[PDB]
């Protein structure tokens, strides 16, 4: 499952974690098994304006 968030929001992507994104965008199960990968894409996603 791929998506984009803010860096400060990477914490919210975790089982049993409460937050706006984790609750209304992408909620993981409490017994989730897997692995979360997050990598910065500022140079490829940020443009002036």
């Amino acid at each position: 499952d791929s998506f984009v968030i803010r860096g400060d929001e990477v914490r919210q992507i975790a089982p049993g974690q409460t937050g706006k994104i984790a609750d209304y965008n992408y909620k993981l199960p409490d017994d989730f098994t897997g692995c979360v990968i997050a990598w910065n894409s500022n140079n490829l996603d940020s443009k002036v304006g």
Partner: protein
């Protein structure tokens, strides 16, 4: 006190049962000893812990 043996058996049984009932109201390290209170105050993860 002529029936001391029978009275003692009754007392032991009653005291064990009362000790169990009293032990039903101990925290054991939880926030509270009331299961309804835990359920109404906490969300699934820490509720189950």
């Amino acid at each position: 006190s002529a029936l001391g043996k029978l009275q003692d058996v009754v007392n032991q049984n009653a005291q064990a049962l009362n000790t169990l009932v009293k032990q039903l109201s101990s925290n054991f390290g939880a926030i509270s000893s009331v299961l309804n209170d835990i359920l109404s105050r906490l969300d699934p993860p820490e509720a189950e812990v």
